[PDB]
Design a protein around this ligand. Structure first.
Ligand code: KDQ
Ligand code: NAG
Ligand code: NA
Ligand code: NA
Lengths: 28, 250, 11
């Protein structure tokens, strides 16, 4: 789907969840 | 999920609960990949060693959930199954090789703040992100230790080097699997457990800021044991089969 | 320990 993987209550609002940064920091 | 935490509302809007009609009970996790298709582990539907062989009419899917046991009126949506498709080379006899299945819903589900599909990886996203040390996220309503949660649980876990996965077990590992979890010397903990089967291992692409399902909760030896790891179906490796099924039955 | 779901889904 064109909109897949973009969560209504997070990415679509530009709000982050409390632990997604842990994932980003691991992508070295 | 062992050593996880309560999910935030709407944190995993692709999460699906596979639910037995009679007796009414949780069977597995699963994920929403479009308005009509749900992805799960084959062993959630077919596992002869445990006398498990479900038909479409045995099952429901519950989408948009947070609470494990409540009927979440005006939030969750419950769908009937039109058809189950199990990978034709799923190996339930030995090591759960190719542990993947699709379920087509009788009618499309309406998306909402709580219901939204996850992406499936392309070759490039899989090559970039499926690397040792890179973390993904596992979610489910399964047991809290090798007892049961009030709401959906979430844990972030690093992908493990393939030789370490191999050397942790006597089970034969294949290219259709990867393993994830912390090492004993790493201090931190966490794993999937009974009841988390079939749920998603997701990663957030740093390139386009979308969530991709890289794995399906497949198998382990115990839950959260030191020196053991959880094993996940390699979704990208089996995507040609996913596409063939959808292009021909959808 | 599951709350009963509406009967319409079990028909
Ligand atoms: O329970 C299951 N999956 C849930 C899960 C997933 C993860 Cl990622 C981590 C832990 C857990 C909880 O065990 C599956 C269902 C069928 C059996 N199974 C196993 O895991 C079997 N484990 S074993 O007997 O120790 C070794 C073995 C392996 C594959 C095939 C045969 C034997
Ligand atoms: C599963 O059940 C179906 C019908 O219930 C049957 O046709 C099929 O052969 C079974 N598969 C196994 C592996 O027993
Ligand atoms: Na970018
Ligand atoms: Na472990």
């Amino acid at each position: 789907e064109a909109d897949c993987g973009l969560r209504p209550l997070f990415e679509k609002k530009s709000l982050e969840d409390k632990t997604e940064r842990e994932l980003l920091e691991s992508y070295i | 999920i062992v050593e996880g935490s309560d999910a935030e509302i709407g944190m995993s809007p692709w999460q699906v609960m596979l639910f037995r009609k009679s007796p009414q009970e949780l069977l597995c996790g699963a994920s929403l990949i479009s308005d009509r298709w749900v992805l799960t582990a084959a062993h959630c539907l077919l596992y002869p060693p445990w006398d498990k062989n479900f038909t479409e009419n045995d099952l429901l899917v519950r989408i948009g959930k947070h609470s494990r046991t409540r009927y979440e009126r005006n939030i969750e949506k419950i769908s009937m199954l039109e058809k189950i498709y199990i990978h034709p080379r799923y190996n339930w006899r030995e090591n759960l090789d190719r542990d993947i299945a699709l379920m087509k819903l009788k009618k499309p589900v309406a998306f909402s703040d709580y219901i939204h599909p996850v992406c499936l990886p392309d070759r490039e996203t899989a090559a970039s992100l499926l690397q040792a040390g890179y973390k993904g996220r596992v979610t489910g309503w399964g047991n809290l230790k090798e007892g049961q949660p009030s709401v959906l649980q979430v844990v972030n876990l690093p992908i493990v080097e393939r030789p370490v996965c191999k050397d942790s077990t006597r089970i034969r590992i294949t290219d259709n699997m990867f393993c994830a979890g912390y090492k004993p010397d790493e201090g931190k903990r966490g794993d999937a457990c009974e009841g988390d089967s079939g749920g998603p291992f997701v990663m957030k692409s740093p390139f386009n800021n979308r969530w991709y399902q890289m794995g399906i909760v497949s198998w382990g030896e115990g839950c959260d044991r030191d020196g053991k790891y959880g094993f996940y179906t390699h979704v990208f490796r089996l995507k040609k089969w996913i596409q063939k099924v959808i292009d021909q039955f959808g | 320990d599951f709350e009963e779901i509406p009967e319409e889904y079990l028909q």
